[PDB]
Ligand binder design. Sequence first.
Ligand code: HEM
Ligand code: HEM
Lengths: 457, 457
Amino acid sequence: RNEAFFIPLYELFLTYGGIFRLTFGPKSFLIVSDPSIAKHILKDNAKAYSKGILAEILDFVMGKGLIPADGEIWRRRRRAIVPALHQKYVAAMISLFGEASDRLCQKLDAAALKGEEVEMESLFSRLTLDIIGKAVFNYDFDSLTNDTGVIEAVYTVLREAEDRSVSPIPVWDIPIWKDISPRQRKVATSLKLINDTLDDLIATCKRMVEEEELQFHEEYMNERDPSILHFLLASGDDVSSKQLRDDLMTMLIAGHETSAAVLTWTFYLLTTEPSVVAKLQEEVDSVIGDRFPTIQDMKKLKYTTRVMNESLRLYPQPPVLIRRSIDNDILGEYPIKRGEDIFISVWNLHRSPLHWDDAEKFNPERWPLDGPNPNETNQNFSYLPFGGGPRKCIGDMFASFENVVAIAMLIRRFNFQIAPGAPPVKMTTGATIHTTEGLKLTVTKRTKPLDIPSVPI
Amino acid sequence: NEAFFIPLYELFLTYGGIFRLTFGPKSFLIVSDPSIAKHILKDNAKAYSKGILAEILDFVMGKGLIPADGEIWRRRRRAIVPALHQKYVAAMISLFGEASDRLCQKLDAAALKGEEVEMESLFSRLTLDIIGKAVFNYDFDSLTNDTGVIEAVYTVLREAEDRSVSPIPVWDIPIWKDISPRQRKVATSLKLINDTLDDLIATCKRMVEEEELQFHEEYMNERDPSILHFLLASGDDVSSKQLRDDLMTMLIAGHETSAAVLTWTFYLLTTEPSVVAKLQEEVDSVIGDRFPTIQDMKKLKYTTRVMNESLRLYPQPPVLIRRSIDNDILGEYPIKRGEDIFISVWNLHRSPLHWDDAEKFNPERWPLDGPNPNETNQNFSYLPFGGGPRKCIGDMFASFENVVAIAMLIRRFNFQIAPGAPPVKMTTGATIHTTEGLKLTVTKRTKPLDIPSVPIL
Ligand code: HEM
Ligand code: HEM
């Protein structure tokens, strides 16, 4: 169809190797699928690269215009935000993960009783939105149940950004010159709605901070408002309201669809291997049963963690990392000048036959169950679930626990199967990998071990 | 590939004078009915804006994405129109004369070396040299030279034509990634043009202060008869930015339009030798080698018809873009606000239902001594200069410009399609360009009353 462009890039990769140039007219793109070269760009010589095309496109959509900002502004804000995601914060977020997942479970119980089919991708999107809003700026979207102005303003921003997501493979369409004016206006309206909502949250929290008798420190957390926003305001760092709003927006977007896609593809993947569902159930039944998981449970949910590890391998979010050279460099042996637009295919890295045995196989036990958890260091940049180098994910522990909690709880409560006559599960791509027409599943209440024998009348 | 108006012609033959073209969630109304076009363009013009075309043009020209108050232009149009009075147009005939003669000198040289000429390019230079002088008293000398400012004009032109809207999809990578650099490159060219305009304004402001002439409807400083001078002598309170914009508007409006008319006229002439004969016969008789004067204009009847007929077969532009800004009825069909409309002038001009032998180059389809054809005359089946409140203000200027140019060239030279010349095909935008140029063979014409000539052995 209008295939996810990383599929053609995979085929081209098998032929042409870990670095090749894609030419189309007077413009070209470098496609990097070599772990060493990816490590060079992302980590060893990261300072020679910007986010190029992706940054420019994203800035335009978000109202920041066509002038690339000083990169040191973000480096500064990132340094300020990272400490907010400390050990104690992540532990407190586990509770939020549990209750939010339970709300989804309530929705699933209802659908199961009525024997209805569910579209899981949509539901995972609502769940993770509710989580990130609460976690980041202490707001309850309640998108699992409602569709409000701000909820719709978020998805309008999302849909628009994804529609502008860059692909080096030409498609059949009318140029969008005619569309710039109306699209930017519609988006601007949605952004103002979100920003006004954020403004009310900033003000509310500033007030809570002034009235506090708490010393700020690296492990600071007001227990009544443990959000990142609260941490940032208790810091005393001088930041404009515009910048702070922009930061909250960044993490909302970074932390929403990412986890939703990971849950979606994990559950798709689970349908393809019943024996994996078996091991998963066995662990969850033993370790947590019906309990909301706690920080101590995370170490013990080993097989669940690996399932997530393996899902992110087969379906990376995003499947491509965009860069642009801003200085001279050598990629392997190949000299390059400033101005090269580069696509690092995480999809190719993760599924490379040269670096993975049975690359297309869903096998959570390809990394020893009791060994170390796989990461970009571990796997020599053949595995990049959370990126690598200075621009890597800052929500990686947050998101790992979020998804382990969600998977574990759901797998405890329900049996999931591909619905009869459900649409085929195909991919579209952007910031994350979406399904083409949803993930339609049959959900039934699971008969748990140690259930009391039941007898209908 | 094809100029999109070609498929719209075929669709028009099937579906008639008004139909909806659908592609996804968006659609365009294609109007080819003279009555409906008269309704939109004239009778109920107030229910329509220039929609997509205006938005696309505003962006490229540095005016952003919020449409200005339409009343601003209506005000400025009222101020500019009086500048193109009878006395002014007469004085421009001299300029038309001398510029065409300069092209003739270039053509004389090429004939001597037996070189082939690419006429579209040369007509573009000719009309650029004419419009710059007539509008803001500047000599581009593009017929002889290549400067930065000349290149800045064509850089703007090329970009605008590349963004010109087509309702028919093409095969390409979306240009979201290119918005920032394109906007920047153009802005650089625009600044160069604007700085030149600023210097011209200043020179003229001083010349106006030190002159002792009363302003009136027939005002014209004989030393600087340009439109710019008239506007400054008016006393109209207008900002420099606005004035610059007006000069840009007319530069663009009066440049490529005439070039395309000359280009397609000369293409058409190669297709009908008997028309060239009649043309030569008239020109030999009426003006000979003389530069035409205002009095010659009435007498150059067949030349006028050749131009009339060229504009019929190759309208500039081939489509007029509108958008409904109120409710309306198009024929019988009810319409809401927000409809994007393409009036196909190409279809109107070539409709078999309204023209006998519509594809035939026949300057005598309007009786030679009858009235000159116009939008009133032809009941909106003929729109060389548009119609209604947004119609061309340079229509008399341009009609004389082209008659002068055609007449002189046909007096002096024989033109033929060059051997092995590229095929003449069409691309489209604000005007109809050829795909690969109009390569012609040019030889000095043996005129009646030429002294018998004998080359030396
Ligand atoms: C399964 C969930 C997630 C995945 C797979 C993921 C993945 C990634 C990846 C691969 C990058 C690097 C992109 C690049 O280098 O171009 C990134 C960046 C980032 N992530 Fe995540 N992420 C997830 C969840 C989160 C969460 C929950 C947060 C915050 C609470 C977050 C915050 C960020 C931020 C702020 C960046 C930009 C860092 C920078 O540019 O310096 N992410 N993410
Ligand atoms: C053969 C040459 C020309 C042709 C075929 C032509 C054709 C047209 C047409 C069809 C329109 C109306 C477009 C629409 O309604 O969307 C128009 C508008 C206009 N023309 Fe011309 N034109 C020519 C030369 C000129 C010249 C020489 C000038 C000025 C010196 C000029 C100034 C303008 C202006 C300012 C407008 C905009 C009117 C408005 O929006 O109210 N044009 N032209």
